[PDB]
Amino acid sequence: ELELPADPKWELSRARLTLGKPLGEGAFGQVVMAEAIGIDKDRAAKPVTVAVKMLKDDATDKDLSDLVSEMEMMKMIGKHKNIINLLGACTQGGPLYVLVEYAAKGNLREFLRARRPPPEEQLTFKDLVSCAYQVARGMEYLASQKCIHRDLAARNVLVTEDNVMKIADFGLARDVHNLDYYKKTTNGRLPVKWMAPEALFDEVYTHQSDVWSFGVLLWEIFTLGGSPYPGIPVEELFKLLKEGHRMDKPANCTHDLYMIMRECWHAAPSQRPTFKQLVEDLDRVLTVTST
Amino acid sequence: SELELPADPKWELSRARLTLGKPLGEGAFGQVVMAEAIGIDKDRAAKPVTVAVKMLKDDATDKDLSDLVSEMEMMKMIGKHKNIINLLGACTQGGPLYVLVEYAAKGNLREFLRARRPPGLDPEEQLTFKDLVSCAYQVARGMEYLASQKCIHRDLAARNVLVTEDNVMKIADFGLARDVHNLDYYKKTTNGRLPVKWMAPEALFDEVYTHQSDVWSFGVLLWEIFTLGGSPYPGIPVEELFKLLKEGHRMDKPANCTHDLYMIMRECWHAAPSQRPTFKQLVEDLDRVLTVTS
Numbered sequence: 001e002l003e004l005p006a007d008p009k010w011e012l013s014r015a016r017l018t019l020g021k022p023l024g025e026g027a028f029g030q031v032v033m034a035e036a037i038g039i040d041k042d043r044a045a046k047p048v049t050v051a052v053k054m055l056k057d058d059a060t061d062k063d064l065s066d067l068v069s070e071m072e073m074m075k076m077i078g079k080h081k082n083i084i085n086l087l088g089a090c091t092q093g094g095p096l097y098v099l100v101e102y103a104a105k106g107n108l109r110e111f112l113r114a115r116r117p118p119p120e121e122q123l124t125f126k127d128l129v130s131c132a133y134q135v136a137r138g139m140e141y142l143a144s145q146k147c148i149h150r151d152l153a154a155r156n157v158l159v160t161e162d163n164v165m166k167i168a169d170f171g172l173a174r175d176v177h178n179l180d181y182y183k184k185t186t187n188g189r190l191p192v193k194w195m196a197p198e199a200l201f202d203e204v205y206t207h208q209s210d211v212w213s214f215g216v217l218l219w220e221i222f223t224l225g226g227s228p229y230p231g232i233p234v235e236e237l238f239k240l241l242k243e244g245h246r247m248d249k250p251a252n253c254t255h256d257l258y259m260i261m262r263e264c265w266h267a268a269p270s271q272r273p274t275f276k277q278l279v280e281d282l283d284r285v286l287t288v289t290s291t
Numbered sequence: 292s293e294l295e296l297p298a299d300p301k302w303e304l305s306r307a308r309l310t311l312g313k314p315l316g317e318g319a320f321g322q323v324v325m326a327e328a329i330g331i332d333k334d335r336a337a338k339p340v341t342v343a344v345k346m347l348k349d350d351a352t353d354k355d356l357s358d359l360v361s362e363m364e365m366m367k368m369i370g371k372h373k374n375i376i377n378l379l380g381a382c383t384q385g386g387p388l389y390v391l392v393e394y395a396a397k398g399n400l401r402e403f404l405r406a407r408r409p410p411g412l413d414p415e416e417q418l419t420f421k422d423l424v425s426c427a428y429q430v431a432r433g434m435e436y437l438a439s440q441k442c443i444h445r446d447l448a449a450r451n452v453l454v455t456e457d458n459v460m461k462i463a464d465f466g467l468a469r470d471v472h473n474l475d476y477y478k479k480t481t482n483g484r485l486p487v488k489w490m491a492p493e494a495l496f497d498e499v500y501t502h503q504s505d506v507w508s509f510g511v512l513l514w515e516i517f518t519l520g521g522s523p524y525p526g527i528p529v530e531e532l533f534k535l536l537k538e539g540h541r542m543d544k545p546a547n548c549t550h551d552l553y554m555i556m557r558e559c560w561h562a563a564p565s566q567r568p569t570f571k572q573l574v575e576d577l578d579r580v581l582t583v584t585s
């Protein structure tokens with residue numbers, strides 16, 4: 001195997017790490033819950049629960065380069081409260097471990113579907129608006145760092161123990177060289193039901209197309225994890241969107257919130273609001289709302 | 292461990308007349324660089340010519356050399372045509388192998404079209420409808436010559452069509468170990484890394500490429516031209532494409548595309564490869580559309 005050169009700013013000794021229960025596995029590799037001691041340099045003995053991204057046994061040379069690419073991307077983007085932040089890395093004396101922040105309550109889609117109205121309590125309208133505001137603030141920071149998510153969705157938003165929203169999978173690598181050449185991998189497909197019409201047509205992703213995806217994410221929040229465009233075949237979605245079709249207003253959703261969804265779904269990408277503007281409009285709705 | 296090549300004086304150019312310049316693209320087993328060649332123009336000899344040079348990288352193996360030599364010899368065997376990237380010369384003696392091919396200043400066809408769309412709510416050329424038909428007509432004539440010279444392309448797409456300064460369509464990367472038409476067909480290997488969106492279904496199953504499979508690819512290339520560089524099958528994930536094609540799915544007619552051009556496009560996507568039109572028939576079909584535009 002091959003060990004990456006150590007970065008003294010992020011390198012953590014793997015003897016300070018205790019791997020635990022797995023959190024899931026995918027085409028990238030596998031995420032394992034773990035306990036890290038000394039990840040806080042101010043409290044060198046405080047144990048902190050972290051999520052460890054590593055390669056599975058069936059990992060090739062490209063899977064290693066993709067994991068390193070995601071790690072180096074998180075270093076350059078910087079830290080923000082509403083994103084999954086990098087905490088450390090183990091590059092010496094063993095396989096590559098990428099330590100990120102741990103979200104105890106899973107992804108946002110499962111967080112909403114498990115709390116639908118009839119022992120995990122129940123969310124209010126102000127809770128759903130706050131969830132959208134935190135995601136908007138996270139996307140505002142990513143866009144300021146010229147980061148295009150390309151896959152913004154409720155499944156890619158993680159919820160912490162303190163009910164903090166953190167955007168995940170933002171520093172992933174894309175098919176840069178051979179974009180029109182695919183190899184029989186596993187599964188996962190394209191998030192066509194979250195993609196803007198111009199993104200479906202040209203396979204080009206912008207901050208404006210991320211805004212469209214945020215509108216679909218907003219629709220997931222107030223449907224408590226509903227599936228977008230139910231019953232619409234994948235081969236007819238682009239034609240329907242191009243002809244003006246938009247998803248209806250979800251049940252128990254204010255006029256202001258549905259307008260924000262419709263603004264994100266404007267046919268012209270230049271007319272859609274920016275994430276900075278979305279933060280302001282969601283903040284104003286959050287102030288006049290009270291429970 | 293000598294790396295010497297046989298002498299072919301009719302194609303040899305003195306490397307003292309070739310000055311290597313800015314890189315144009317680094318592939319996997321090679322690289323292309325811009326260069327200036329003097330005394331090579333067939334009309335005005337004193338006029339230097341900007342060319343593209345195919346050469347090996349610093350870590351190239353002896354098999355990479357054999358591949359580049361084979362591509363050069365394939366360009367010799369196929370011959371010259373206006374609508375392909377032609378061979379101009381080679382530096383094979385007293386130094387590294389330089390394969391000189393024609394230079395296309397305006398890049399590939401996909402980026403050529405995308406950079407010339409109408410303004411989208413936010414100052415170059417403006418392609419008329421007859422310009423798009425002329426673009427498709429030139430690519431068809433290039434494939435007709437390659438098909439007549441026993442050459443299958445296997446990767447016909449807008450990205451593999453280059454545009455010169457004179458807006459001439461030239462098919463590129465046609466000699467990358469691709470030549471089966473003498474008699475019996477020829478299969479390939481397994482694995483992947485292949486353009487699914489441009490491949491015929493029979494080329495996707497048994498992995499055997501024919502001239503009929505290239506015609507399917509040309510149909511997809513027609514869709515790219517009249518969408519001004521759109522990505523094929525919008526909204527269809529790659530994993531679900533082959534199943535939809537078997538069930539009879541075909542792309543919808545592009546916006547502002549004539550019915551006749553859509554019919555030409557649709558017969559390229561005939562399920563039976565025997566029923567697809569030949570490139571000779573495609574040239575006559577496009578030339579008919581080209582003459583009836585007044």
Ligand SMILES: Nc1ncnc2c1ncn2[C@@H]1O[C@H](COP(=O)(O)OP(=O)(O)CP(=O)(O)O)[C@@H](O)[C@H]1O
Nearest residue numbers: 023024025026027031051100101102103104106107
């Ligand atoms: N940093 C983290 N903290 C807490 N949980 C995490 C986490 N990263 C991932 N998970 C959990 O692991 C699960 C799988 O995440 P993963 O990134 O592998 O998705 P995936 O690429 O395998 C496709 P899918 O989610 O549809 O299975 C997620 O549902 C999530 O709950």
Ligand SMILES: Nc1ncnc2c1ncn2[C@@H]1O[C@H](COP(=O)(O)OP(=O)(O)CP(=O)(O)O)[C@@H](O)[C@H]1O
Nearest residue numbers: 315316317318319323343376392393394395399464
């Ligand atoms: N004759 C020519 N004139 C002008 N540009 C050329 C050229 N030949 C190649 N190029 C450029 O050099 C690059 C070569 O492509 P590159 O090898 O880097 O990627 P690639 O491996 O995907 C080629 P392919 O898709 O055919 O396999 C391209 O960007 C192309 O535009």
